[PDB]
Amino acid sequence: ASSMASEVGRRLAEFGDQVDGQFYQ
Amino acid sequence: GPLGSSRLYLQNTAVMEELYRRNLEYWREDGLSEEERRTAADAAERMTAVIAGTPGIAVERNVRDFRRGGWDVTPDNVESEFREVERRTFSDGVHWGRVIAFLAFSMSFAAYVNSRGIDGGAYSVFNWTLRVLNDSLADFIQRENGWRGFIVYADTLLRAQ
């Protein structure tokens, strides 16, 4: 797959981690 | 799949319909209690709020980024592009944050492929994403108390946002 797809997925993993961290304060 | 799969399928469908309506028609082509239908709409509303308050995954901003990068999607490779984003998003594991981010992505991606003139593109993206919830994320969703649990989780986020 495109480099763009792998980079988008990687950033979704990291932003998702940032979103989830806010649940724990 | 897991416990109560049949009801979760219908509820995942309602969450997606509400989510895509609230954030974006072109992405389309019962059995629920009025409770479950209401919990689905509430979950789609909170998730829309979480997404909007998270600039990294905002729907509009990502469509702009996909266009600027000239993301090479065609009728022939668009599923494999989607699947690669899916694989990488959850390669470390599954939690609600990555679910929210992936669903945000799926709306940006559906709008993007529709803007690329891929006939049926957004409809396919919607159907793939619905079935990621049904087939791959269902065990997580049920473990965390379903869409009722998501609302508790999301309220906590919005209090913190």
Side-chain angles (χ1 to χ4, degrees), chain B residues 11 30-42 148:
Chain B
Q11 208 173 19
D30 199 14
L32 282 183
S33 72
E34 210 55 25
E35 175 91 24
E36 293 156 354
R37 190 161 315 113
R38 195 161 65 94
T39 291
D42 291 335
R148 199 91 80 157

Side-chain angles (χ1 to χ4, degrees), chain A residues 1-24, chain B residues 50 54 56-57 66 69 71 80-81 84-85 88-89 95-98 100-101 105 153 156-157 160-161:
Chain A
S2 73
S3 288
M4 186 72 59
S6 307
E7 171 68 5
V8 165
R10 179 185 72 76
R11 285 210 310 256
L12 293 176
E14 314 212 340
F15 288 132
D17 293 340
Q18 297 172 15
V19 167
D20 199 60
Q22 295 204 252
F23 173 81
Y24 301 91
Chain B
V50 171
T54 316
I57 62 175
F66 300 167
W71 190 345
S80 56
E81 293 297 313
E84 170 62 12
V85 174
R88 181 57 189 91
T89 298
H95 58 64
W96 275 128
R98 286 169 174 161
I100 295 168
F105 155 74
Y153 171 90
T156 296
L157 294 189
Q161 270 181 18

Side-chain angles (χ1 to χ4, degrees), chain B residues 41-51 150-151 154-155 158:
Chain B
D42 291 335
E45 184 262 13
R46 310 281 195 277
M47 190 182 303
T48 300
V50 171
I51 293 166
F150 173 77
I151 292 164
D155 284 348
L158 300 176

Side-chain angles (χ1 to χ4, degrees), chain B residues 134-154:
Chain B
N134 293 346
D135 296 342
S136 298
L137 303 172
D139 296 318
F140 169 78
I141 290 162
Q142 298 291 74
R143 178 184 323 126
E144 300 303 333
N145 283 330
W147 294 112
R148 199 91 80 157
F150 173 77
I151 292 164
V152 170
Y153 171 90

Side-chain angles (χ1 to χ4, degrees), chain B residues 63-110:
Chain B
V63 175
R64 176 195 319 142
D65 289 1
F66 300 167
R67 283 158 174 187
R68 182 178 66 246
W71 190 345
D72 177 22
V73 300
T74 74
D76 280 317
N77 74 9
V78 61
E79 179 174 13
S80 56
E81 293 297 313
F82 176 89
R83 297 305 182 185
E84 170 62 12
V85 174
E86 173 195 3
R87 186 201 63 84
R88 181 57 189 91
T89 298
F90 298 105
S91 81
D92 293 300
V94 179
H95 58 64
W96 275 128
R98 286 169 174 161
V99 172
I100 295 168
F102 186 73
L103 291 178
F105 155 74
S106 78
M107 295 182 287
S108 294
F109 196 65

